[PDB]
Design a protein around this ligand. Structure first.
Ligand code: NA
Ligand code: NA
Lengths: 360, 359
C-alpha cells in the first residue's frame, strides 16, 4: 500500500501556497511594494554588516562549523550564559522539532495552551505525540490551575509556552512559570519576541532548573528570518544528548556569518527594536479606532484584534490582500474570529489604515 | 531521571571537532593556504553568479519559500523530470533524515551496506530503527545475493545505497539496482557524486519505480557545501505525504538563491567537473606509485587508499596535516586501515605528493 507511516498519511493534504512574489505579480506590483504584515517579519532588515558579510563569503564550498563555535561565543557574551548551555539551530523551528524528537516517544503527551504558535501542534503530530490543550483565559493568561490538574492526571512529558505569546503578545508571570516548573515535566519557554518587551530573558534560569529550556531567534527583531538561525539555552543534562543526536550541518555558513554580523551592531539592533516598539503603540491606537476591530495589548511586534460587528476575518484579510496588504487570519476554530497585524514601518501602517478606511 | 528518549541515551558521546579556521591557525597557515582534501569539497567553488546573488539578497528578513518553487522549476529543467517529483532539502542530509522519519517507526529495520556514508546508520539510530548490515565485498561491490536473502528473511522497510559510493567511489551496476528494486522494499539511491561519473542519473527511473528515490546535492560538484541545499526525485505517491510532514523553512533563502544561481551557469559547472575528473586520473596514478598506498578505482571526486603494513594511517594523516594538507582518516574498525584523498586543483595534488615525499 504505502511505505509512509500511516500516522502521516492521516495528515490533511498539503495546501499549496503562492509566494508573496506571486501575489505581487498578480497585482502588477513589485514585491517590495507589498505591505507585508502577516508574519512578524522586521521590514527594516538586519544591520548593514550582514549584507556586507553575505556578499563576501570566502568559503561557500566548505561545510559549516557543526558546533557554531564563533556564534555560540558571541551568544554567551550577549546572554551572560556560558556557551556550554547554548545550542544553535536552523531557526528556533529546528530546535522545537529537535526537542520533540529527542524527548517524545510515540504516544507521549505534550501540553499546549491555545491560542498559540501553530508549530507546536504541527511538530507534535509529525513526531507522533498527543496534545493536551489547556486553553488560555479570556485575557490570554495561562490557566495554571488547569495545567496542574491535567499534568497530574495525564502525565505529559513536555509543555511549550510562548512569552510574549504569539498571537496576542501577552507575557507569562514569573510565579506562574515557577509553579509549572515544579511539575515533573519539561518546560520549553519560547522567547521568540522577548526583545520587543522590557522583560529580561530567562535563559539564565536553565542553570537552576534542569526541566527548563529557553528558545530565541534571529528571525524577528534581528531581521534574519530568511537565513534560518535561532538558538536556545539548555540544561547541561539535556544538551549533552542533543549534541549526540543532532544533525551536523543544518545551520548554513550564511546563517552563522549573518547572526555573528548582526551581533556586531548592537546600536542598530536596539534602534530598530525601539522604532518597532514605538510604532506598535501608534498602530494599537489606530486599530482601536476601527469600529469592527478590538486590539489586545501586546509586548511583541504584532497586535491581535478581535473582529466584531459581523465582519468576517477571512473576507477582511482577502480584501486587504487584493489591495496589496497582507495580514494574518486564522483557519482553526480557536482563532477564526481574529486577525493579527504585524508592526512594520510607519508608512506600512499608513497604507494599512488607508485600505481599512476604504473597506469601512 | 532524564527526559531524553532511552534509545538516544545509548548514542556514543559527542566528540568535539576543531573548526577549520582554528585548525589552520594551529598549523600556522591562512585557511586559504591549507590544502583541504578531506571532505570532497570543490576547491574551485561555485559559479560566479552565486556570490553575485548572495551579495544582493533583497529579502533576508522574509521567510523563504517553503515550496522552493523557483529552484524546483530550475531542477525540473536541469533533470528532465517534472517538478511535481522533486523535493528540496537542507542538503541531501535533510532528505535522508526526512525519508527515515516518514517511513520508519521505532524498531523497523533498514538495510545498510558498509563501508559507506556514515549518515545512514547515524540517522537510523537517531530515528530508533534497527540496521541490518550486509557488508560489501572486498572490492566494495554490493553482495546482491545476500541483500536479496536478508530482505526476504527479515522484511526490512528500506535500503539506502550510494552510487558512486563514499568512500571508495564504485558505481552500482544498473542490473544490480534493478534486482534490488524487484524486492518489496523502498530503495533510496544516493547520487551525491554522480556528476563526476559518465553514468546518467537515475532520477528518471522514479517515474517507473514507485519504490525508488534518488537523492542529489549541490554540496560537491556545484561547490555549495556551506549553503546547505540538496534535492531528490520521489514517486508521486510518496512526495504527496512528504509535503504534509516536512518542516516548512529549513531551506534558507541563501540556499534557494545560490542553487538557482549555480544552475544559471552550466558552462562553469561542466568545466569544473571536467577539471576535477581529469585531475582524478592524474592523482590516482601518483598515489599508485606511492609504495605504502593502494588506491581504489573511483567514479567520484575522491580516491580511497589502503595503507600497507607498518604505516600508521593516523600518524600519516597527522604528519600531512602538520605540513598543511588535510586528508580523511577513519576511526571505525572497518576503515581504520584506509585514508580517503579528495581531488582538488592540480597544484593541490602537487603539494600533497611533495609532502608525501618528505615523509
Ligand atoms: Na475598535
Ligand atoms: Na602504491
Amino acid at each position: 500500500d504505502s511505505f509512509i507511516r500511516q500516522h502521516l498519511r492521516k495528515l490533511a493534504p498539503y495546501q499549496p501556497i503562492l509566494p508573496f512574489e506571486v501575489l505581487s505579480s498578480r497585482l502588477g506590483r513589485k514585491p517590495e511594494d507589498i505591505v507585508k504584515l502577516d508574519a512578524n517579519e522586521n521590514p527594516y532588515g538586519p544591520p548593514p554588516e550582514v549584507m556586507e558579510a553575505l556578499g563576501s563569503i570566502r568559503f561557500p564550498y566548505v561545510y559549516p562549523d557543526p558546533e557554531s563555535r564563533r556564534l555560540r561565543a558571541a551568544l554567551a557574551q550577549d546572554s551572560g550564559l556560558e556557551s556550554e548551555y547554548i545550542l544553535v539551530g536552523c531557526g528556533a523551528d529546528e530546535l522545537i522539532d529537535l526537542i520533540m524528537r529527542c524527548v517524545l516517544d510515540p504516544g507521549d503527551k505534550i501540553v499546549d495552551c491555545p491560542p498559540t504558535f501553530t508549530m507546536y501542534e504541527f511538530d507534535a503530530a509529525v513526531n507522533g505525540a498527543l496534545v493536551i490543550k489547556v486553553p488560555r483565559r479570556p485575557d490570554f493568561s495561562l490557566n495554571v490551575e488547569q495545567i496542574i490538574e491535567v499534568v497530574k492526571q495525564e502525565k505529559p512529558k513536555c509543555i511549550f509556552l510562548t512569552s510574549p505569546n504569539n498571537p496576542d503578545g501577552s507575557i507569562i508571570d514569573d510565579d506562574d512559570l515557577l509553579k509549572i516548573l515544579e511539575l515533573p515535566i519539561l518546560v520549553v519557554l519560547d522567547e521568540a519576541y522577548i526583545e520587543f518587551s522590557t522583560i529580561e530573558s530567562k535563559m539564565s534560569w536553565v542553570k537552576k532548573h534542569d526541566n527548563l529550556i529557553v528558545l530565541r531567534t534571529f528571525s524577528k527583531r534581528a531581521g534574519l528570518a530568511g537565513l534560518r538561525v535561532g538558538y536556545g539555552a539548555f540544561p547541561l543534562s539535556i544538551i549533552k544528548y542533543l549534541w549526540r543526536a543532532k544533525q551536523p550541518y543544518n545551520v548554513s555558513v550564511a546563517a552563522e556569518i549573518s547572526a555573528c554580523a548582526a551581533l556586531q551592531n548592537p546600536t542598530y539592533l536596539e534602534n530598530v527594536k525601539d522604532a518597532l516598539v514605538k510604532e506598535r503603540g501608534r498602530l494599537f491606537d489606530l486599530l482601536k479606532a476601527v469600529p469592527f476591530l478590538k486590539p489586545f495589548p501586546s509586548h511583541s511586534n504584532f497586535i491581535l484584534c478581535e473582529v466584531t460587528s459581523g465582519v468576517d476575518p477571512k473576507k477582511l484579510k482577502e480584501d486587504l490582500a487584493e489591495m496589496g496588504v497582507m495580514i494574518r487570519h486564522y483557519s482553526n476554530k480557536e482563532l477564526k474570529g481574529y486577525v493579527r497585524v504585524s508592526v512594520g514601518k510607519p508608512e506600512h501602517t499608513d497604507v494599512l489604515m488607508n485600505c481599512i478606511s476604504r473597506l469601512s
